[PDB]
């Protein structure tokens, strides 16, 4: 195999800021680089290929090239579409590989999130299962702490997390945390804190339910 | 214009076989080669099979020899992957892509079927409204969940009024706990919206031919 050592694995950059995304093979591939760029959608178009001709259609703004064994694409001045994730290709030998990746993501800026706790639903509750939801809306950086305290102890084993991508529009993320518990161990305690902890403020964004009559 | 459209996933079991087809139209078939690659559930892409447009030099990636067979219809415009042996590895979206980028010109991918090979069996999810009664998020706001628990395999449609509302809406991906999947999906609506309004979940697990609606209805 020809290993294509692609780098770096993810970076996120301003808009307007350039980027170098890195191929390195491993051996004569005479330029027989590509670059394919999947967009979220899972959808696959290709950038460049010969290791440097731009494809109809690609923006100028995108420009592969070569120096020794080392590939590289640069992306001058990175305006939205460029959201995505990178591939480099070498179609020169038989067994075809694939570079490792590179996750662009958009540095915006700061954004706490918006936690909203909701407690088991009463059809669950008759399933004998007891899930309390608490998602984290909007937030920036990805960098999130969630702590899940049922009456006045922290708990882990039961915990279910789930991270979006970076939105299309707002450019932040959202969060799931889903606490499961048997209707019984619910039912038998009262309290329910969802805390989470985010770099935008130093006080644990708390949001907590209580059970008991309503 | 140019279009590949791959169609043969689905759940299989380990040891089993799948035979996908990759429909092409916009371009002659017949004189390019063409490829498999395929994409496992959140990691890169990678080569699986090549066969030239005569049908006369295949090629096959170390970790699909033997079990897999390469193959086209040049006069049905259909190129084929014949799978043997599916272990749990096998698992991914494979997508089917035209190639001979030497000269060639376009570069034409595929959108990627999906084939999950687990032991596992099916299993139709169980949709929990989230109604506030604590969704605060700002007071001026209302919040609204779902909760679709226990299904496998993917994928499930979640949708937020039948489609009609699709602004706000936050799903999330799915997650395998044991031997199942759980998603939820959060939206967003101004207080007055709701509950003067009507929102509703309606979750749809295609591989179990499960519909379902829930009116998120105030209370707890
Ligand atoms: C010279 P040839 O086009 O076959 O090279 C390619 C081989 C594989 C490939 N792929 O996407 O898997 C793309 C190009
Ligand atoms: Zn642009």
Same mark, same amino acid.
Request: net charge neutral.
């Given at each position: 195999?020809?290993?294509?050592?692609?780098?770096?694995?993810?970076?996120?950059?301003?808009?307007?800021?350039?980027?170098?995304?890195?191929?390195?093979?491993?051996?004569?591939?005479?330029?027989?680089?590509?670059?394919?760029?999947?967009?979220?959608?899972?959808?696959?178009?290709?950038?460049?290929?010969?290791?440097?001709?731009?494809?109809?259609?690609?923006?100028?703004?995108?420009?592969?090239?070569?120096?020794?064994?080392?590939?590289?694409?640069?992306?001058?001045?990175?305006?939205?579409?460029?959201?995505?994730?990178?591939?480099?290709?070498?179609?020169?030998?038989?067994?075809?590989?694939?570079?490792?990746?590179?996750?662009?993501?958009?540095?915006?800026?700061?954004?706490?999130?918006?936690?909203?706790?909701?407690?088991?639903?009463?059809?669950?509750?008759?399933?004998?299962?007891?899930?309390?939801?608490?998602?984290?809306?909007?937030?920036?950086?990805?960098?999130?702490?969630?702590?899940?305290?049922?009456?006045?102890?922290?708990?882990?084993?039961?915990?279910?997390?789930?991270?979006?991508?970076?939105?299309?529009?707002?450019?932040?993320?959202?969060?799931?945390?889903?606490?499961?518990?048997?209707?019984?161990?619910?039912?038998?305690?009262?309290?329910?804190?969802?805390?989470?902890?985010?770099?935008?403020?130093?006080?644990?964004?708390?949001?907590?339910?209580?059970?008991?009559?309503? | 214009?140019?279009?590949?459209?791959?169609?043969?996933?689905?759940?299989?079991?380990?040891?089993?076989?799948?035979?996908?087809?990759?429909?092409?139209?916009?371009?002659?078939?017949?004189?390019?080669?063409?490829?498999?690659?395929?994409?496992?559930?959140?990691?890169?892409?990678?080569?699986?099979?090549?066969?030239?447009?005569?049908?006369? +030099?295949?090629?096959?990636?170390?970790?699909?020899?033997?079990?897999?067979?390469?193959?086209?219809?040049?006069?049905?415009?259909?190129?084929?992957?014949?799978? +043997?042996?599916?272990?749990?590895?096998?698992?991914?979206?494979?997508?089917?892509?035209?190639?001979?980028?030497?000269?060639?010109?376009?570069?034409?991918?595929?959108?990627?079927?999906?084939?999950?090979?687990?032991?596992?069996?099916?299993?139709?999810?169980?949709?929990?409204?989230?109604?506030?009664?604590?969704?605060?998020?700002?007071?001026?706001?209302?919040?609204?969940?779902?909760?679709?628990?226990?299904?496998?395999?993917?994928?499930?449609?979640?949708?937020?009024?039948?489609?009609?509302?699709?602004?706000?809406?936050?799903?999330?991906?799915?997650?395998?706990?044991?031997?199942?999947?759980?998603?939820?999906?959060?939206? +967003?609506?101004?207080?007055?919206?709701?509950?003067?309004?009507?929102?509703?979940?309606?979750?749809?697990?295609?591989?179990?031919?499960?519909?379902?609606?829930?009116?998120?209805?105030?209370?707890?």
């Amino acid at each position: 195999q020809i290993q294509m050592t692609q780098s770096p694995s993810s970076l996120s950059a301003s808009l307007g800021e350039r980027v170098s995304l890195t191929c390195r093979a491993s051996q004569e591939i005479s330029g027989y680089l590509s670059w394919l760029q999947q967009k979220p959608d899972g959808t696959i178009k290709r950038l460049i290929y010969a290791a440097s001709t731009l494809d109809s259609g690609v923006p100028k703004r995108f420009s592969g090239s070569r120096s020794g064994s080392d590939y590289s694409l640069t992306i001058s001045s990175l305006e939205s579409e460029d959201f995505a994730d990178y591939y480099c290709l070498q179609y020169a030998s038989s067994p075809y590989t694939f570079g490792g990746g590179t996750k662009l993501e958009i540095l915006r800026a700061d954004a706490a999130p918006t936690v909203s706790i909701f407690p088991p639903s009463s059809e669950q509750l008759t399933s004998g299962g007891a899930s309390v939801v608490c998602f984290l809306n909007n937030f920036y950086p990805k960098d999130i702490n969630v702590k899940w305290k049922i009456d006045g102890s922290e708990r882990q084993n039961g915990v279910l997390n789930s991270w979006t991508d970076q939105d299309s529009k707002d450019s932040t993320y959202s969060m799931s945390s889903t606490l499961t518990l048997t209707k019984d161990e619910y039912e038998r305690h009262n309290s329910y804190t969802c805390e989470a902890t985010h770099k935008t403020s130093t006080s644990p964004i708390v949001k907590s339910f209580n059970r008991n009559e309503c | 214009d140019v279009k590949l459209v791959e169609s043969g996933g689905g759940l299989v079991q380990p040891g089993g076989s799948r035979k996908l087809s990759c429909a092409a139209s916009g371009f002659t078939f017949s004189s390019f080669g063409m490829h498999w690659v395929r994409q496992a559930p959140e990691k890169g892409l990678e080569w699986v099979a090549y066969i030239s447009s005569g049908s006369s +030099t295949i090629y096959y990636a170390d970790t699909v020899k033997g079990r897999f067979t390469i193959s086209r219809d040049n006069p049905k415009n259909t190129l084929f992957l014949q799978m +043997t042996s599916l272990r749990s590895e096998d698992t991914a979206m494979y997508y089917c892509a035209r190639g001979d980028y030497y000269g060639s010109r376009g570069a034409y991918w595929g959108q990627g079927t999906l084939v999950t090979v687990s032991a596992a069996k099916t299993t139709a999810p169980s949709v929990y409204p989230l109604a506030p009664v604590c969704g605060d998020t700002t007071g001026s706001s209302v919040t609204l969940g779902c909760l679709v628990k226990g299904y496998f395999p993917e994928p499930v449609t979640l949708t937020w009024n039948s489609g009609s509302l699709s602004s706000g809406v936050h799903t999330f991906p799915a997650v395998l706990q044991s031997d199942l999947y759980t998603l939820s999906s959060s939206v +967003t609506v101004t207080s007055s919206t709701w509950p003067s309004q009507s929102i509703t979940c309606n979750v749809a697990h295609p591989a179990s031919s499960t519909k379902v609606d829930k009116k998120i209805e105030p209370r707890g």
